[PDB]
Subunit: 391 residues, 4 copies
């Protein structure tokens, strides 16, 4: 078995006519046929090859094959955002009258899709604490079609047991388990090997890694993949990845192994610094023995990630003061970029909401979320240290 | 009022820091804030500027403003395909229990979304002949939320009266009229000026014009646009246009006026050639006085388009023989490219279906669809002429 | 013979493995061999195919073939600027001890290369008035290796007789005639058909047309082309065109015919407006019967171009006042973009120089240079008219 | 002082109007002025900002600043190939009658430029063994304008002492020392800190790192940089980097530190494997204590690189047999890509030449050149091992 760097670099490649080393950018909408009969054979699935980029594209196929190889699944599908991957999947496999079990701690736009979108179209959704196996067992119904999971998950890097939850879900023979593996990536976690049916990613984050593409990826069995491609993507979302962006992500994947290694190395060192810092009252990190679900993280994750959240003891003003004094870390949403990113949800993403509303949503006044980048760790720590001195 | 070329070239531009002549390609996922407070102000809609490309991007904003200016609507939204524009719109404005009135002659993937997708999620859809005003009146119900129209529409370039249909739809105060204006483009037809509520496009076709981008556009009133952006696009499709592709379309729009002029000039000359040709039994073209709805086309279209369909008197084998002998026209799906494209649906797109099934779908054995390109018309005609000689 | 639009759109295409309609972007540095022996055969020129993008690239080859087809020459070479095309050519064909005959009215950077660059490396250069055939005859020497010409040429759109000058040059069997055909383009002028040996272009201007690429092109006989490629480009300039930029230019060429037609249509109408305007004392345009060399322009140009210069009777302050009040025309260097561009050399490009110095260089205080774009001509004229009212 | 990763990621950034995280791609030829007077001020160097991409471009400026920061020099200049960087520099600083001292072991195209190009234009060139300090001292003349060096250099990874050679060169007050630092990169070697005047790179190799760009970079003092920009690049080569390619290289530099670390880690392990392998008679690697100049390499290089050459004891047929059996390593020219590349010069690049001719050029029948990539080292070694078994 080839190593992960070898796989990220080489897996899934397709031939080209000129033997270019780089994967060509097939920046095309349509494809020409040699004859009427060849066109007919492609539409009848009797001959291999391409028709139209919304259906598939050779640049995109390489990307799809690569992510499937990394997750050790049968088939990949690419979309023009993580929400495109998630929605295309859900619109394919659900119908009015179906039921979904999921967590309240889900990526915000996914929560909105679940709570306000799917429910408008006749889907029943129950939100439970998926760290409580009994709650999940009790929420299962005959018409549960999807159990949707995310681990680690915002804002406190909650860990849930994918293998155990999948066994519970699969007591109903019609239930699919879908996992958003964005934060962990296939460098750390391979949900399909734990019995999950479908993996989804925001490739916008670590997989691309360079903060320049919005994209999503799905990995699953061929039978399900073909439905997600030819129903969800083709007709119900149209979230078609641009060939240029497919190329950018392929290119980003050339450094995926070494980026993830450095992200995690940096992060573990920063966790130790923050957890020993007098102005930080608590650190949320899956690799701390004091983190809830540490033992689950240790079983299902090869490393503990490069996201860190932490609570400043000085609360709201401490969060703003820290961030406003940083010179290296960048104030922004998103994660998984080569540059370190940081946000203070109480003053930034959750500015429309009262303290009470924020706290109901798990956002505390001193909570800071850090996406650790690839800078020299001494420089990231020096920046945090000087900022913390100002509180 | 500026002319259409002036508008396509100059409308909607945003400033950049360096005064580059070309619109910069803001190939970014995220945006940095100067302070925590600035981030908060953007999330609270208290300060202008950007957050994250799925929400909006400055390159994409220029494109959005341009198409809104061309359609003479308030607001534009861009997506990563025409189906992204269509689906994002429909998921925003519909809910389970709503009803839709539309035509059986709709773009195939839209038909599939209507007939198999929306119906799975509790939406009622009635397909009528929207060229028959009484049929449309009779299909209206209290819960009709959308009347969805397309003109000219495949495979016989059917014309329907947008102004008249919109008046019928608007007898219900909750009904929105949505028009797919892809074929006509704002060079020929501006549905919002006829009382339509929302215009959608596959920018993959004429607007981009260069056969290298999959993209969609929506134009509507600001109130509706903001919902389509922040609900449909943000959460329910994630069909986020890549900044590179946004740039390609802006670039394509620099020649939109002159491309459409040449497309139509070429097409009218080719229509005359085909309609007088002994091996062609019938031509479908909105500008022929013998075309059904010619008088409606004359009222609502400034020119009659660059799509032509025609029936070869020799049927199925004549279609294949013609196409297999062409040297300039390219055998492919799609339309609106600078290169002339041609397809024979009976042997190509509809190869999975029996003659009976095809004929029920309006596909006759000798039907050929031609997307007239920008080549010198003498060369396009010479190619068709030599191909027709082989039948 | 195919028309110019057909040729621009279709000529020079290469196959690709997937039959994409758009030319793939082979964004690669290097190319892989199937075997050691295949690599050897390519290096020994025994097998066709690619090695490394500085030598050649399939995307770039299409562009090269297209410009060669448009100029009706044997071979094309692409570079990363017009100055790259010019310098690569000159470094290939010259040596210390050679002589060059050229005009003082040459593109400024070419003049600098001739007067200050080549002369530093042992090349003798004589600058004459190439509109005076006797001056050119008298400048010829046994060691004259290049006669370098440009028509129309800045700042007064000087016309020189390419066929006549080439006959004079070719009285020496070792002399090559090189023409910068940027302004005229192959839509108007095909110097190789008049006996010229090498044509050079700044593709930055009309050929790309979209103000987003810096690039150069050369067309000549295969024997000379191979030397320019494998000596000048390979080793002496390294002015290697990026595959992305090659694609942009191919894409720009899809509309070359219709762009040039509209550029010239607009320009002729604007010339009439300016030449009849009371505040304009003189117009420089090859198509005016009062222009020097009008009859030569009529013989060697199919149309008279889209560059216009004109003298405002109010001089220096009138130039600045006009330009500072324009709202549609953009203040910028360059030409041949879809947007109308304008400059006042006395206050802009020639700001470092005294009135005396400027006038020696042919720059008069009221001289304005206009690159007519593709906007609706009524809008361009309205903008100029309101600006002229302010003088 | 910030670490090298921090510097590569963050140095040299310019602001943009929207605070995009990624550097915008200013894919423009020209720049617009607010007024005639602003244009004049820019041409008179009285106001900062841009004019035209051949002169400079904001995307490219970021790249230039980054490489200058990495080399710890004052100013950077970018070109569209390494040969563009080299030639632009040489044409700027030389003139007919000048003399150059350099090595016979120079990159092949540079050797050709020196031996056949510059000599055609009146420059005297002496080729010496620059590992012999006395030879270099003896070659110095009053008119020596350039001492041009390269270390490590093909085909045996020759090492020369940059500090010592620079002292010899600088005994003539008019002599500039130019070093091609491509192989070593600023991760290993910073020639300006050793007294060198100008550093040149093929950014095509490690700096970009992703095998998808042809580009060059120069770093030197501001006074020299401005001459190379405004003479060499502007007029004498026109080797203008495309903004897209500038962006690709900036993007590549985000992972420069971690890529170089893994390249070298992999390479050192492969050197040990090859040097102990019974079918390999000799390994050329700067870090072997048996390599000539090992002690010089240890003084001027922080690590010993990721290029390896080696001699197979079985000669010509062994080279071909090895390469023809490899499944992971790719047969190609170039180096510094994320993928491992390999070549056998005797059968590939030097296929036109006899054994005698090859051996005079230092190419021996069993010589193999390996550019070690970023794949898992166990996989690279397994591939080499199985290939070596076939000899």
């Amino acid at each position: 078995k080839s190593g992960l760097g070898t796989t990220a670099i080489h897996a899934g490649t397709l031939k080209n006519l000129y033997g270019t080393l780089a994967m060509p950018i097939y920046q095309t909408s349509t494809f020409i046929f040699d004859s009427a009969e060849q066109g007919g054979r492609r539409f009848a699935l009797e001959e291999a090859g391409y028709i139209y980029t919304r259906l598939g594209n050779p640049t995109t196929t390489v990307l799809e094959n690569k992510i499937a190889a990394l997750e050790e699944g049968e088939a990949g599908i690419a979309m023009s955002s993580g929400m495109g991957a998630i929605s295309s999947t859900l619109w394919t496999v659900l119908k009015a009258g179906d039921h979904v079990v999921t967590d309240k701690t889900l990526y915000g736009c996914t929560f909105a899709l679940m709570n306000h979108g799917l429910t408008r179209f006749g889907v029943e959704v129950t939100f439970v604490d998926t760290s409580n196996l009994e709650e999940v067992k009790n929420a299962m119904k005959k018409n549960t079609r999807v159990v949707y999971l995310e681990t680690p998950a915002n804002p406190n890097l909650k860990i849930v047991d994918l293998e155990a939850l999948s066994k519970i879900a699969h007591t109903n023979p019609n239930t699919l388990v879908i996992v958003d593996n964005t934060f962990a990536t296939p460098y750390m976690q391979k949900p399909l090997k734990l019995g999950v049916d479908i993996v989804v990613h925001s490739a916008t984050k670590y997989l691309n890694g360079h903060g320049d593409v919005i994209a999503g990826l799905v990995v699953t069995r061929q039978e399900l993949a073909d439905q997600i491609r030819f129903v969800g993507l083709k007709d119900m979302t149209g979230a078609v990845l641009g060939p240029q962006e497919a190329y950018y992500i392929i290119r980003g994947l050339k450094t995926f192994e070494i980026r993830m290694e450095r992200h995690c190395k940096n992060a573990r060192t920063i966790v130790d610094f923050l957890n020993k810092h007098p102005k930080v009252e608590k650190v949320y990190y899956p690799g701390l023995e004091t983190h809830p679900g540490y033992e689950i993280a240790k079983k299902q994750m090869k490393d503990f990630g490069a996201m860190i959240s932490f609570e400043l003891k000085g609360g709201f003003e401490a969060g703003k003061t820290l961030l406003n004094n940083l010179k290296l870390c960048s104030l922004a949403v998103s994660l998984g970029d080569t540059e370190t990113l940081i946000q203070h949800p109480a003053s930034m993403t959750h500015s429309p909401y009262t303290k009470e509303e924020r706290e109901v949503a798990g956002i505390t006044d001193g909570l800071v979320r850090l996406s650790v980048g690839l800078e020299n760790v001494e420089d990231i720590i020096a920046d945090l240290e000087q900022g913390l001195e100002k509180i």
